[PDB]
């Protein structure tokens, strides 16, 4: 009878990075460099998992 | 009877990167460089998983 | 009787990258470089998985 | 001038298995089930990376 | 001038297994079930990385 | 001038296992179930990294 329910889920992940140089040179604005294995289950809202959301104005 | 339900789900992932140089040189605006194995189950909202959402104006 | 339901789902992924140089040189605007194995199940909203959504205006 | 030399080498591997049942039912002899991403650089000898080498006799 | 030398080498590995049942039912003999990302650099000998080497006799 | 030398080497490993049942039911003999990310650099000898080496006799 048990109902098995799964939403916004990330599992069984195995990342391997090999980097000599990772440079981010930002001058103003917004930057989102690296996002791995993240989850969010929002209700009644504006959700942004990995988003550079620049409200740049005068 | 159990109903097995799965929504916005990412599993069984095996990433292997090999990078000598990863450079991001941003001058204003928005940048979203790398997104791997992410999940989001939003309800009643404007969802953006990996989006550079630049409201750049005067 | 159990109903097995799956929506916006990504599984069993094996990425292998081999890069000497990955450069992104952005001057204003929006950039979305790399998106792998992501999921989103939105309800009643405007969803953007990997989208450079530039509202660039004066 | 540097000489870059590589022998019996395995790199940049990303395995993803999804198995409900893996059974090995052996009755005597030799069994080698699973070998992934292995290396051996032998010198002056009889090398066997993944070999069922049964010397079965009376 | 530096000489970069690499022998019997395994690197940058990302394994992901998902198993409900892995059974090995052995009755005598030899069994080698699972070998991942191993290395051996032998000199003047008989090397066996993953080998069921059964000397079964009377 | 420095000579960078690497032999029988395993590095940068990321294992992820997900097992409900792993059973080994052995009745005599030899069993080698699981070997991950091991290294051996033997000199003047008979080396066995992961080997079921059964000298079963009467």
Swiss-Prot record, chains A, B, C, D, E, F:
It comes from the Eukaryota. Keywords: Acetylation, Alzheimer disease, Amyloid, Cell projection, Copper, Cytoplasm, Disease variant, Membrane, Metal-binding, Neurodegeneration, Nucleus, Parkinson disease, Parkinsonism, Phosphoprotein, Repeat, Secreted, Synapse, Ubl conjugation. It is found in: Cytoplasm; Membrane; Nucleus; Synapse. The modification Phosphoserine is found at residue 48. Cu cation binds at residue 11. Highly expressed in presynaptic terminals in the central nervous system. Expressed principally in brain. One of its GO terms (molecular function) is phospholipase binding. Sequence repeats lie at residues 3-17, 18-28. The keyword Heme does not apply. Phosphorylated, predominantly on serine residues. Phosphorylation by CK1 appears to occur on residues distinct from the residue phosphorylated by other kinases. GO terms for biological process: adult locomotory behavior; amyloid fibril formation; behavioral response to cocaine; cellular response to copper ion; cellular response to epinephrine stimulus; cellular response to fibroblast growth factor stimulus; cellular response to oxidative stress; chemical synaptic transmission. GO terms for cellular component: actin cytoskeleton; axon; axon terminus; cell cortex; cytoplasm; cytosol; extracellular region; extracellular space. Neuronal protein that plays several roles in synaptic activity such as regulation of synaptic vesicle trafficking and subsequent neurotransmitter release. Participates as a monomer in synaptic vesicle exocytosis by enhancing vesicle priming, fusion and dilation of exocytotic fusion pores. Mechanistically, acts by increasing local Ca(2+) release from microdomains which is essential for the enhancement of ATP-induced exocytosis. Belongs to the synuclein family. It is linked to Genetic alterations of SNCA resulting in aberrant polymerization into fibrils, are associated with several neurodegenerative diseases (synucleinopathies). SNCA fibrillar aggregates represent the major non A-beta component of Alzheimer disease amyloid plaque, and a major component of Lewy body inclusions. They are also found within Lewy body (LB)-like intraneuronal inclusions, glial inclusions and axonal spheroids in neurodegeneration with brain iron accumulation type 1. Parkinson disease 1, autosomal dominant: A complex neurodegenerative disorder characterized by bradykinesia, resting tremor, muscular rigidity and postural instability. Additional features are characteristic postural abnormalities, dysautonomia, dystonic cramps, and dementia. The pathology of Parkinson disease involves the loss of dopaminergic neurons in the substantia nigra and the presence of Lewy bodies (intraneuronal accumulations of aggregated proteins), in surviving neurons in various areas of the brain. Soluble monomer. Homotetramer. A dynamic intracellular population of tetramers and monomers coexists normally and the tetramer plays an essential role in maintaining homeostasis. Interacts with UCHL1. Interacts with phospholipase D and histones. Interacts (via N-terminus) with synphilin-1/SNCAIP; this interaction promotes formation of SNCA inclusions in the cytoplasm. Interacts with CALM1. Interacts with STXBP1; this interaction controls SNCA self-replicating aggregation. Interacts with SNARE components VAMP2 and SNAP25; these interactions allows SNARE complex assembly and integrity. The 'non A-beta component of Alzheimer disease amyloid plaque' domain (NAC domain) is involved in fibrils formation. The middle hydrophobic region forms the core of the filaments. The C-terminus may regulate aggregation and determine the diameter of the filaments. This is Alpha-synuclein. It comes from Homo sapiens. The chain holds residues 40 to 97 of 140 of the full protein.
């Amino acid at each position: 009878v048990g109902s098995k329910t799964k939403e916004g889920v990330v599992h069984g992940v195995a990342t391997v990075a090999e980097k000599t140089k990772e440079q981010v040179t930002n001058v103003g604005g917004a930057v989102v460099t690296g996002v791995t294995a993240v989850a969010q289950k929002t209700v009644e809202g504006a959700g942004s998992i990995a988003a550079a959301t620049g409200f740049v104005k005068k």
